[PDB]
A and B are shown apart, each in its own frame.
Chain A
Amino acid sequence: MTTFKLAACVTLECRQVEIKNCSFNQKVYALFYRLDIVPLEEERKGNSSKYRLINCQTTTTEAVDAATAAKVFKQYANDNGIDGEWTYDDATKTFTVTEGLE
């Protein structure tokens, strides 16, 4: 099986400017304190690395492929108080639902 993650926060791609120059999705850039963000992968001294904001709710499910994972995550987001714009990344198998840019 493949395990998929649903995140109720933005994923960030960040590089060194202490202070990191981060983008979220198209690409909006902003500067963050390194304390506010959480690594989703190994941190890179040269290029960018994927990060998370400290405040995040996540859940997971096993599925034949992403199309079935979206069934369950849409259900989870209706049963709980979750809304937003959706996004899927196949490299990490992570869905993201965010209500940003409002």
Chain B
Amino acid sequence: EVQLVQSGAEVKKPGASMKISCKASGYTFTDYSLHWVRQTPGKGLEWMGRVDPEDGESHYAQKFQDRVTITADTSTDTAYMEVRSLRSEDTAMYYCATDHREDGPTYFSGVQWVPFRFWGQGVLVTVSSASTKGPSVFPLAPSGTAALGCLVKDYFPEPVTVSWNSGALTSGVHTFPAVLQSSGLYSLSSVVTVPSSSLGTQTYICNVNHKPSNTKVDKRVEPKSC
């Protein structure tokens, strides 16, 4: 029911800015304040601030009161967070989150208020001097199961999503973590293990998505001529 749907990943030059966003559905948007929480990679969660959608009231943590500006639009039920003067340290997952009420676990408890009950999916914003570089996608053709896959090569920054057959194929699928390779770019693999009997009789398509470069790729994966 309740959904907080965040914007896509980005990359930004130092000194630049970002305006991240978060759509809400499934609750009365103006009943609960929307919060923002950051997560530097390998580091913990850290509350940024909040906005109360029924008016313009916003609040911030001592760290972020200088550069950040959180707003809410109740015509679209979308909350936005703007962050100026970006720095190398700001490379993080940014989450929107909201409180929600529940009738408690027991008859005696009553209607409770639960902090950060729902979270958005998160958006990875990378801050770097280096420019965006989109993925080159190549098929890993199969030579009683056969393995076939897609190589998602030389892209920057993270992240990359890979599905198969538009999400209809999930059994035997394994997408691997990317190698951060010496040059600074990323390379990633997804493979799906498959009955070799099906190679002439099922089309396998990997769907690659690199939101930082707005790149989307469909690659059919076929066995070669023998």
Number of chain A residues close to chain B: CB under 8 A = 19
* Contact across chains for A34 and B109 when beta carbons are under 8 A apart: yes
Among A37-57, those with CB < 8 Å from B are: 37-39, 41-43, 54
Contact yes or no, B101 A3, CB < 8 A: no
CA distance A66 to B30 in the complex (A): 16
Question: Which residues of the partner chain A approach B113 to less than 8 Å between Cβ atoms?
Answer: 39, 41-43
Q: What CA separation (Å) do A70 and B207 show in the bound complex?
A: 54
A60 to B30, CA, bound (A): 10
Say whether, besides A39-B113, A43-B113, A3 and B30 are in contact (CB < 8 Å): yes
Question: What distance in Å separates the Cβ of A36 from its nearest Cβ neighbour in chain B?
Answer: 7
Q: Which of B55, B101, B108 touches A39 (beta carbons < 8 Å)? A: B101
A35 touches B109 (CB 8 A): yes
Is the Cβ of A3 less than 8 Å from the Cβ of B74?
yes
With a cutoff of 8 Å between Cβ atoms, the chain A residues found around residue B75 in the complex are 1
Q: Cβ of B111: which chain A residues have Cβ within 8 Å of it?
A: 37-39, 54
Quick check: A38 and B30 within 8 Å, CB to CB? no
CA distance A60 to B55 in the complex (A): 13
Render B104-148 as a binary contact track against A, CB cut-off 8 A, 1 for contact. Answer: 000111111101000000000000000000000000000000000
**Contact between B54 and A42 (Cβ–Cβ < 8 Å)?**
no
With A1-B74, A3-B54, A3-B74 given, is the CB distance from A36 to B99 under 8 Å?
Answer: no
**B55 touching A37, Cβ below 8 Å:** no
B interface list, Cβ under 8 A from A? 30, 53-55, 74-75, 99, 101, 107-113, 115
